[PDB]
Amino acid sequence: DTYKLILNGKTLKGETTTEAVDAXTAEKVFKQYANDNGVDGEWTYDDATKTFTVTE
């Protein structure tokens, strides 16, 4: 399924999606993607929208 990541850095903001077999896989893509973007933060997931958010 399509999983989504909202990057809410202090100043750097964006979003990306990945196609993954499960939300394990998508998280362990996204938790690489945020750390390419230099956004270390706190992580939440919303299963209703299959969306991860990292907030700095």
Token pair of 5, please? Answer: 């990541």
Give the start-to-end residue ranges of the domains of the chain: 1-56
What is the experimental resolution, given in Å to one decimal place?
2.0
Q: Strand 42-46 and strand 51-55: pairing?
A: antiparallel
For residue 27, give the nearest of 44, 9, 10 by alpha carbon.
44
Q: What is the DSSP letter of 40?
A: -
For residue 1, give the nearest of 25, 29, 20, 16 by alpha carbon.
20
Q: Domain 1-56, CATH 3.10.20.10 — does that match? A: yes
Token pair of 36, please? Answer: 């390419």
- Do 18 and 3 contact (CB within 8 A), yes or no? yes
Strand, coil or helix: 26:
helix
